[PDB]
Design a binder for these strands. Structure first.
Ligand SMILES: [Zn+2]
Ligand SMILES: [Zn+2]
Lengths: 68, 104, 914, 114
RNA sequence: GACGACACA
RNA sequence: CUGUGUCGUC
């Protein structure tokens, strides 16, 4: 049961990523969408975790939201 | 706007993974990765009181895996060797210090 | 023994005395060489077992075997004398393997026999066969044709997927490496046909009597007459050879200085568009004897069959001329004494050069229809746009319109509304459940639309077999008899979704409603009359779409301009509405899976098949791969209903308009025009029915090549043998139409191959015993037809054969089928994938459509098509729909007999209306 | 409803006609046999500015090297090289080592050098 | 019939 | 984008 919630949270992660006008670059958005796609197309619970934490590293590299 | 961020934070505090909360805590207390974690990582440490707990020598605990510094950078772009960190010569710099690590 | 050595020194005679005893002194009768025979008993293009051959072999220097065999047979005196008496006439032209007739005594006494000279190992018939009837795990005489001719290496096949087209497209190069050989074959066949005419030899030319080195042999089916008059019947050879003339590109050397593959490409004049004299010279060089008047242009044809013939020739004849001369032609039309540059003609890759007729310089002003036809050409757009060189794709770039290319991103779909909290609450999405959410709204970066448009790189020039197409068209039109058609006026047309994209540039000022309301009825009809005499090229804006899928590929939908659809609707609405409004036929479009629809459709497919086993298929990249000749065939089959409304010139101008508008038009992907090599533009008005016509064409072609390529000497029936005889005869003889046998073959198909064809997705109910004896087609007969006609490869992992009847089609229109019980009335039910249903439920396209205000109607349309899950034996499948109904009731509550809280709604949508 | 769209199409035609009623086009049509030339040659022969899209460094190396490259049989002088972010990229920043630091699709724009 | 929605190609 | 079916007002 730790794959459906992971895929859905990856979807909401890519959504909140684009919501910050991150789509205004080539490398960053290409890598982000590759992460999201390889999360969705995954079945393993660990690779999805690694790509999730990489997406979260992307989200925290900027300063749009830190400590609610 | 804030609804997506709220849902994301709730269902990140619902997954409850080790590396996930590790990254979230480090980003809460200042440690921000200057790039995307590859699978060569750079992190900023806005202080030193919350740094003694994470790195010690060539060992670096981050992303639930091991990292290893290769050279440390400071604000004025000097190579701070890792035995300079002490309780006396601390306020002689701007606290954001770039740590350049590597995988196993 | 000594007899064998004498046999060797006697077969040698004048050639090299270093032959290898391949087989034995007796006839080695090597098995399974595909013949092309036609006599009073057997007919077809099949793979009979040879018995008379003895394929000796000479070895090259250094004791290395070489690709050269002497086929020593055991002929009789009669045919021996016949062959000698028709070979002494032709002993001068090059395309004659030196038959070298002689005698010996191979029985102990008094036995005559022949011994050939340097033909090949494998035959031209084997080349054509192994290229047509392609098997992914049986192509043994195709891993040798490609190897023994330096085209590739042996280890190229250990690479898995070596044979595919839509992946590993270097096989195109490995095949095209045979182009010079096939061109030498064409040359030699011409130096043979003319050598026969100028020497008086009347007879027939077949494929298995040539050889890859170009040589010819088996000169027995001829007969001698007064020299100077004899004509060879060369329909079969050219017809069966055609489909590989554009698979090996036998005309890749006419683009050179002295037609060799070393000199630089012809520095063609930029300002030359006619090319009709060069076309006549191409025909006089390669098809000097193809016995039917070939017009370089297609405007000088006689009927749709002449159009198919001439266009099928030109689709190969126009791979030589530079791609910088096709597309529209332009002229300096003056308006008020100001030079306009618009289209006063068109150069088609197949239909030749066609010129407009309502063209006139020195116009004092312009009207609405004139402004439309002007601002719709790519002429004024590509004449003032910056030259473009796009290195991201292969399609011929034309002109960047703006000053910077535009990238567009594909957003990700919403997720996790309260219909996932409830899904995880009500015992779903737990550890390894029977269902798992496996349908997402995937996302793509900026460089997606152009990399997806680049998938037209799989569309190639294709020269279909014309003597077979000119019969498949009749069978298809028989499949289309029960529909009425014909041109309709403006007032009689009906338009739905009047607020869609009106195409480029028309989308810069409004939707299609704007133009349809601005133009008057007289103006629309005058534009239609004008387009029935003039050719109008248009532009299709190809943009990305946003939908859910189980893959991560992008979906690019195209929107044609409005001046194209506005006329195509008047042209085709009658026939399309008639196809939609009829039930019980083959093409099932306009059906309704509700109210016993699925059950009645499946019964009509089970109509009266004797020993039934269902089937199914899918064409990979169907739209990106459909050849231009098959698209033109579909256009002509759709236009065949016009016989009392428009003359031949009117209908030819309408076909040319359709081609220039939807087949090979200007596509604006991004901010720059491109040349669309072919395929079916999604925004076409008639694409869902052109795909049906193409579907029936592929199925009938598979049936023809399964009933011909079967060994007629192994057909226990006494009627199918004669039906196959007359099938081959109506294919490659009797240039006219044979309504008798067309009717009888259509009846045979309807009785033993019950198709069910909604666009691009079909299910069949074939007689299993016949499809096992080879009297009809199978997946092994669809894969091959695709590989040599549509230039794709149909993997057997997406094609299902159902050996049972109780359980219905595994998947038709993405729905499953479960034979259910409705009160002692066992009927069929369409049920979908529960993963897809749960995905559609949880997610939503974009966040304005969260089910918060009045959007429960979104969730009712999911249980309307997810009801039969409740009747599945797996309890979780039923719990899918029960969870659906529970949360639909909770939605109805929090929002406070069409009440969607009780299941007495979905139960009614599957029992007949009354 | 009708005058607006008619004026739109008319002024659009007469506007793309400003950069179309030049002398190079009249020169190339004065050479044709019957005042009729194919469309695919009009921009390729008379358009006074080139736009080449470039996905990576290898195609750039052999398509737009130096400053003067020859496409469509003419000299082209390069100005305003830009990348996928609509960001100006100097000719020095396009190097093999720095190629993984800039956007993949570039847009090089040249002018017809007489 | 007008509008919106969902599903299939 | 082209259509096909199925639901909701006037
Ligand atoms: Zn003709
Ligand atoms: Zn008509």
């Amino acid at each position: 049961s730790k794959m459906s919630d992971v895929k859905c949270t990856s979807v909401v992660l890519l959504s909140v990523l684009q919501q910050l006008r991150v789509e205004s670059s080539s490398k960053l958005w290409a890598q982000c969408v590759q992460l999201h796609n390889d999360i969705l197309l995954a079945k393993d619970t660990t690779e999805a975790f690694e790509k999730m934490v990489s997406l979260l590293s992307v989200l925290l590299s900027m300063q749009g939201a830190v400590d609610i | 706007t804030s609804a997506m961020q709220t849902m994301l934070f709730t269902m990140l505090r619902k997954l409850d993974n080790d590396a996930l909360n590790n990254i979230i805590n480090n980003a809460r207390d200042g440690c921000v990765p200057l790039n995307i974690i590859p699978l060569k990582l750079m992190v900023v440490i806005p202080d030193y009181n919350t740094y003694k707990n994470t790195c010690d020598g060539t060992t670096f605990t981050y992303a639930s895996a091991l990292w290893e510094i290769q050279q440390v950078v400071d604000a004025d772009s000097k190579i701070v060797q890792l035995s300079e960190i002490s309780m006396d010569n601390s306020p002689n710099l701007a606290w954001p210090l770039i740590v350049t690590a590597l995988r196993a | 023994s000594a007899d064998a050595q004498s046999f060797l020194n006697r077969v040698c005679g004048v050639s090299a005395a270093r032959l290898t005893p391949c087989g034995t002194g007796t006839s080695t009768d090597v098995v399974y060489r595909a013949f092309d025979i036609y006599n009073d008993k057997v007919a077809g293009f099949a793979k009979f077992l040879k018995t008379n051959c003895c394929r000796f072999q000479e070895k090259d220097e250094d004791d290395n075997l070489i690709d050269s065999y002497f086929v020593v047979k055991r002929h009789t005196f009669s045919n021996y004398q016949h062959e000698e008496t028709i070979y002494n006439l032709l002993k001068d032209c090059p395309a004659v393997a030196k038959h070298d007739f002689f005698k010996f005594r191979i029985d102990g006494d008094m036995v005559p026999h022949i011994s050939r000279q340097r033909l090949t190992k494998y035959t031209m018939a084997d080349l054509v066969y192994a290229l047509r009837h392609f098997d992914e795990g049986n192509c043994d005489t195709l891993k040798e044709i490609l190897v023994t001719y330096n085209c590739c290496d042996d280890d190229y096949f250990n690479k898995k997927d070596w044979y595919d087209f839509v992946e590993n497209p270097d096989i195109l190069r490995v095949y095209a490496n045979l182009g010079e050989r096939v061109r030498q074959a064409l040359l030699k066949t011409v130096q043979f046909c003319d050598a026969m005419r100028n020497a008086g030899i009347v007879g027939v030319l077949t494929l298995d009597n040539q050889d890859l080195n170009g040589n010819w042999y088996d000169f027995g089916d001829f007969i001698q007459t007064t020299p100077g008059s004899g004509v060879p019947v060369v329909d079969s050879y050219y017809s069966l050879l055609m489909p590989i003339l554009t698979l090996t590109r036998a005309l890749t050397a006419e683009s050179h200085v002295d037609t060799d593959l070393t000199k630089p490409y012809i520095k063609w004049d930029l300002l030359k568009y006619d090319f009709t004299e060069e076309r006549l010279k191409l025909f006089d060089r390669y098809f000097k004897y193809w016995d039917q008047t070939y017009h370089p242009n297609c405007v000088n044809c006689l009927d749709d069959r002449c159009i198919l013939h001439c266009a099928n020739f030109n689709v190969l004849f126009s791979t030589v001329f530079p791609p910088t001369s096709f597309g529209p032609l332009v002229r300096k039309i003056f308006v008020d004494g100001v030079p306009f540059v618009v289209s006063t003609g068109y150069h088609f890759r197949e239909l030749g050069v066609v010129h407009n007729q309502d063209v006139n310089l020195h116009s004092s002003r312009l009207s609405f229809k004139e402004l439309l036809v002007y601002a719709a050409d790519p002429a004024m757009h590509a004449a003032s746009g910056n030259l473009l060189l796009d290195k991201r794709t292969t399609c011929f770039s034309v002109a960047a319109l703006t000053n910077n290319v535009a990238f567009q991103t594909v957003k990700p779909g919403n997720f996790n509304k309260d219909f996932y909290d409830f899904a995880v609450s009500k015992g779903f999405f737990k550890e390894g459940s029977s269902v798992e959410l496996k349908h997402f709204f995937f996302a793509q970066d900026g460089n997606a639309a152009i990399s997806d448009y680049d998938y037209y790189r799989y569309n190639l020039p294709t020269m279909c077999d014309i003597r077979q197409l000119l019969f498949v068209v009749e069978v298809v039109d028989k499949y289309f008899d029960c529909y009425d058609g014909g041109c309709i006026n403006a007032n009689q047309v009906i338009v739905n979704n009047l607020d869609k994209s009106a195409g480029f540039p028309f989308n810069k000022w409004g939707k299609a409603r704007l133009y349809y309301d601005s133009m008057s009825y007289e103006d629309q009809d005058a534009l239609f009359a004008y387009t029935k005499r003039n050719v109008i090229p248009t532009i299709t804006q190809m943009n990305l779409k946003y939908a859910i899928s189980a893959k991560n590929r992008a979906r690019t939908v195209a929107g044609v301009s409005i001046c194209s659809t506005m006329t195509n609707r008047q042209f085709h609405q009658k026939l399309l509405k008639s196809i939609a409004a009829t039930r019980g036929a083959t093409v099932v479009i306009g059906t309704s899976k509700f109210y016993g629809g699925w059950h009645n459709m499946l019964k009509t497919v089970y109509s009266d098949v004797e020993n039934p086993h269902l089937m199914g298929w899918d064409y990979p990249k169907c739209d990106r791969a459909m050849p231009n000749m098959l698209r033109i065939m579909a256009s002509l089959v759709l236009a065949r209903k016009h016989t009392t409304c428009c003359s031949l010139s009117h209908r030819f101008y309408r076909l040319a308009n359709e081609c220039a508008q939807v087949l090979s038009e200007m596509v604006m992907c991004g901010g720059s025009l491109y040349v669309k090599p072919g395929g079916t533009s999604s925004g076409d008005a008639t694409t869902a029915y052109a795909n049906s016509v193409f579907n029936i064409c592929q199925a009938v072609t598979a049936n023809v090549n399964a009933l011909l390529s079967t060994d007629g000497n192994k057909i226990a029936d006494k009627y199918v043998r004669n039906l196959q005889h007359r099938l081959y005869e109506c294919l490659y003889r009797n240039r006219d139409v044979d309504t008798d046998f067309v009717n009888e073959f259509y009846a045979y198909l309807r009785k033993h191959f019950s198709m069910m064809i909604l666009s691009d997705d079909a299910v069949v109910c074939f007689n299993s015993t016949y499809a096992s004896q080879g009297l009809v087609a199978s997946i092994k007969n669809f894969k091959s037809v695709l590989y040599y006609q549509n230039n794709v490869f149909m993997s057997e992992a997406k094609c299902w054969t159902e050996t049972d009847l109780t359980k219905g089609p595994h998947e038709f229109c993405s729905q499953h089928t479960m034979l259910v019980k409705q009160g002692d009335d066992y009927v069929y039910l369409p049920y979908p994938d529960p993963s897809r249903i749960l995905g559609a439920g949880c997610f939503v396209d974009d966040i304005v459509k969260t089910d918060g205000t009045l959007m429960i109607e979104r969730f009712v349309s999911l249980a309307i098509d997810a009801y039969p899950l409740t009747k599945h034996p797996n309890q979780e499948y039923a719990d899918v729909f029960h969870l659906y109904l529970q949360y639909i009731r909770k939605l109805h509550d929090e929002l406070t007999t069409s009440r969607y809280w009780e299941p007495e709604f979905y139960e009614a949508m599957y029992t007949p209306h009354t």
